[PDB]
Paper text:
In the current study, the crystal structure of ChlB3 was solved at 3.1 Å-resolution and a catalytic mechanism was proposed on the basis of conserved residues of structurally related enzymes. The protein structure was present in the space group of P212121 with four dimers per asymmetric unit. The refined model of ChlB3 contained 334 residues in each monomer and no electron density was observed for its 197–201 and 227–230 residues. ChlB3 structure is organized as a homodimer and each monomer having its own active site. Each ChlB3 monomer has a seven-layered core composed of two layers of helices interspersed by five layers of sheet, with several connecting loop regions around the core. The core region features an internal duplication of two segments (14–183 and 184–339) that are comparable in structure except at their loop regions, although there is no major sequence similarity between the two halves. A total of 2627.6 Å area is buried in the dimer interface of ChlB3 protein. The main chains of Thr205, Arg215, Gly112, Ala185, Arg239, Gln110, Gln92, Gln90, Gly102, Asp103, Trp89, Gly85 and Glu190 are involved in hydrogen bonding at the monomer-monomer interface. Generally, in KSIII enzymes cystine is responsible for the transacylation process, although histidine and aspartic acid catalytic residues crucial for Claisen-like condensation. ChlB3 catalytic triad (Cys113, His296 and Asp301) as shown in Figure 2C, significantly differs in electrostatic character and geometry, despite the catalytic cysteine (Cys113) occupying the same position as those seen in both structurally related enzymes. The volume of active site cavity, as calculated by the program CASTp 3.0, was 934 Å3.
Chlorothricin (CHL) belongs to a spirotetronate antibiotic family produced by Streptomyces antibioticus that inhibits pyruvate carboxylase and malate dehydrogenase. A previous study reported that ChlB3 is involved in the conversion of 6-methylsalicyl-S-ChlB1-ACP to 6-methylsalicyl-S-ChlB2 with catalytic efficiency kcat/Km = 1690.70 mM−1 min−1. ChlB3 is a dimer having the same active sites as CerJ (a structural homologous enzyme) and uses a KSIII-like fold to work as an acyltransferase. Structural comparison indicated that ChlB3 belongs to FabH family and showed 0.6–2.5 Å root mean square deviation (RMSD) with structural homologous enzymes.
Author numbering:
A (entry chain A): 4 to 196, 202 to 224, 229 to 346
B (entry chain B): 4 to 197, 202 to 225, 230 to 346
Write the structure that this text describes.
C-alpha cells in the first residue's frame, strides 16, 4: 500500500536576526561567530494552536481537500501549547477538521513529526480505501520558562508551524519509507532533576553538561553516531534506493559546524545539498525543521519530479528518525 | 484482522480514605456525603514513569512476552510526568522494551487510552503478521499545581498506572471495536476563561466548567454531548457485532455516584450493580486508567469470565466521547 503526500503547508512569523540579539545582550557575540546562524522566527503573543491552524489551512487549501474527509489528526509539539488539562488538537477540530476524526496529541521532542508520519501511514493502510490524514507541528518558545537564544546548545529556537496531508490516493509526492531508532542509554542527556515536574526553567546546555560529566559505559555518543547511520541505511533499504539517488538532505537547523560534521560529513555529502542556508534564518522550529524544508524545496521548484529528499533528525531519547520523500509530479501550487 | 489483548497490568499505591481527608481539612464534608466516594490512591514522591514501569512489567510478565518483540509503545497521560523537554516513554524504553520500537507519548485527557487502542490496533493491522504493541497510562496528581480533592468537579484524582498488551496472535481476550467521536463546539469547557501564556496558574476544572456554563447560557452544546454519548456506544456495539444485552459489565470513569448513575448507567438503561463503581470509588480518577484498571480487576478476580463482554465508556476534553468493547474468550493465564 502506497502512502502519498497530497500537500504541505507552514506558517512562519517575522524573523529576528542575530545582529539584533547581540546588541540587546540576549545572544553572545562569540556564539554568533561560532554558530553562523541567520536569525530566529519570533511569533510573540500568537498562540501555537493558531499557528498550527494557519499551516493546516494552507495544506488543505493547496490541494483542494475537504477537512471533513480526514480520518486522522496528529498534533505534534515539544513545548507547552496552552492551558493545562486541555490539548491543542481540539482547536483545529473546532475551526477546520470537525469532530468526526481521531484527534490526538503526539509528543517525541523534535522527532515527533517522524513518529506521526509512521502512525499516520499505518492508520491509512489499515483503514478504508479512500483515506486521508493531517499531521501538524507548532510551537511558541516565547515564554517565561524558555530562552530561545541560550536554552539549546548549537541552535536558536524558533516559532512557527509545519503541516502535511497524507493520503492513500495518488498525489504529487510519495512517502517511500520512515523509521525511528533510539539509544535509550542516553536518555539522561535531556534531563537533570523527576519527583516534581514543573517549576524549574529549561536549559539543555546544562543538562548536556551534567550528562557529559558522568557516564557509567560512556560509549553512548558513539552508539548514537552508529545509530544515525544505521537508521539512514534502514530507511534507504526499505524505500528501495541508494544514497546516490538522494538529491537534498533535510536536517534540523543547528549550527553550521554541527550540521556539517554530524549529518553531511557523516553521510559523505556536500553542504550545498543540505537545507542549511534556508534553515539558518528560521532557526530550530521544534519539530518542523524538515517539513518546512520540504515545503520550501517543493514550493520553489528546487525539488522537481524524480528527486528524493532525505529527512533526518536526532532528538531526546536519544531517538534518531529518518524518512525518504519522493517527488513524482510538480506541486499543484507552484 | 483480529486484535487480541495478550494481557493487562496495573499499579495502585496505598489508598487514602475519604474520612481521613475530611479530618485534615482537604475534602469537604458536604462533597463526601453528596458524591459518596470511598477514597483515592496516593503515591508519595514516586514518579509516573516508574508507576508505568511497574504496570508494563506486570502485563508483560503475566503472559510470558519478551519486551523486545514489541513493535509499538504508546505512553498516555493527562498531566505532567517529569522534566520538560523530555518524554516518559524513554524511561520504559531503557528499563524494559528497548530502542528498537516506535515509542511515542499520547495525550487526549482521560480518553487518551481509547485513542491509543485505536492507533495500536491500526499499527498492528498494517504491520507484519506476527505483531505486538504495549499501551500504558500513568499519572501522579500530588501537587504543586493540582489539588487532587478540589480540582476536578465530581471526582477525586488518584495516582497509579494502567497497562495492556495488544497482539495479532490469539490471546485470552479480544478487542472487538473501539471508536472516538467528539463535540468540538464544547472544547472551551475544559479551557474556561484562560491562552497566550502557557504556565504559572494552577488547574481547577470546577471554575473552568463554571465559566463555560456562563458562555453556554448567552447553541445546544450539552445536548450534542449527550446525543454523541449514546451515538458512539451504538456504533461501537454495531462495529463489534453485538447488542446492549450482550454487555455483562460497564467500565465508566471513577466519578461521583450521581454522575456515574445519571450520565452513563441511567442513560444506557442498565443497573448500577453492572458498573465498576464499587471498585473504582476506592481508587478515584486515575487520569486515563479508570477503564483498563477496571478491565484488569474484573479479569483477574474471575467476575468477567469466558463469553462475557465489557463496555468501556469514556468522556474527556474535546469534549471527546470514546467507547470500546472487550470480549473475554478464555480465562486469564495469570489467575
Amino acid at each position: 500500500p502506497d502512502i502519498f503526500i497530497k500537500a504541505t503547508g507552514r506558517f512562519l512569523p517575522e524573523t529576528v536576526s542575530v545582529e539584533w540579539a547581540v546588541e540587546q545582550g540576549h545572544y553572545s557575540a562569540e556564539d554568533a561567530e561560532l554558530h553562523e546562524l541567520g536569525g530566529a522566527a519570533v511569533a510573540g503573543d500568537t498562540p501555537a494552536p493558531d499557528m498550527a491552524l494557519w499551516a493546516a489551512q494552507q495544506a488543505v487549501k493547496r490541494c483542494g481537500h475537504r477537512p471533513e474527509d480526514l480520518g486522522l489528526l496528529l498534533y505534534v509539539d515539544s513545548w507547552h501549547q496552552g492551558p493545562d488539562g486541555w490539548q491543542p488538537q481540539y482547536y483545529l477540530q473546532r475551526h477546520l477538521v470537525g469532530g468526526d476524526v481521531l484527534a490526538v496529541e503526539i509528543q517525541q521532542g523534535c522527532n515527533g513529526m517522524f513518529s506521526a508520519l509512521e502512525l499516520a501511514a499505518a492508520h491509512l493502510r489499515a483503514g478504508p480505501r479512500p483515506g486521508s490524514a493531517l499531521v501538524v507541528a507548532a510551537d511558541n518558545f516565547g515564554t517565561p520558562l524558555f530562552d530561545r537564544w541560550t536554552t539549546g546548545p548549537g541552535y536558536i529556537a524558533g516559532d512557527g508551524a509545519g503541516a502535511v496531508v497524507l493520503t492513500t490516493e495518488p498525489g504529487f509526492a510519495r512517502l517511500l519509507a520512515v523509521r525511528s531508532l533510539a539509544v535509550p542509554e542516553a536518555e539522561q542527556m535531556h534531563r537533570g532533576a523527576p519527583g516534581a515536574t514543573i517549576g524549574r526553567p529549561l536549559n539543555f546546555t546544562s543538562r548536556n553538561a551534567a550528562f557529559r560529566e558522568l557516564s557509567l559505559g560512556t560509549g553512548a555518543l558513539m552508539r548514537v553516531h552508529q545509530r544515525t547511520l544505521e537508521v539512514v541505511e534502514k530507511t534507504l533499504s526499505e524505500a528501495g534506493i541508494t544514497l546516490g539517488d538522494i538529491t537534498r538532505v533535510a536536517y534540523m537547523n543547528f549550527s553550521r559546524e554541527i550540521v556539517e560534521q554530524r549529518c553531511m560529513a557523516a553521510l559523505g555529502l556536500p553542504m550545498s545539498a543540505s537545507t542549511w542556508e534556508f534553515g539558518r534564518k528560521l532557526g530550530h522550529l521544534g519539530a518542523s525543521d524538515q517539513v518546512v524544508a520540504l515545503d520550501e524545496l517543493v514550493t520553489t521548484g528546487e525539488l522537481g519530479p524524480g528527486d528524493h529528499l532525505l529527512m533526518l533528525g536526532m532528538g531526546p531519547g536519544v531517538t534518531l528518525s529518518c524518512a525518504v520523500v519522493k517527488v513524482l509530479t510538480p506541486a499543484p501550487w507552484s
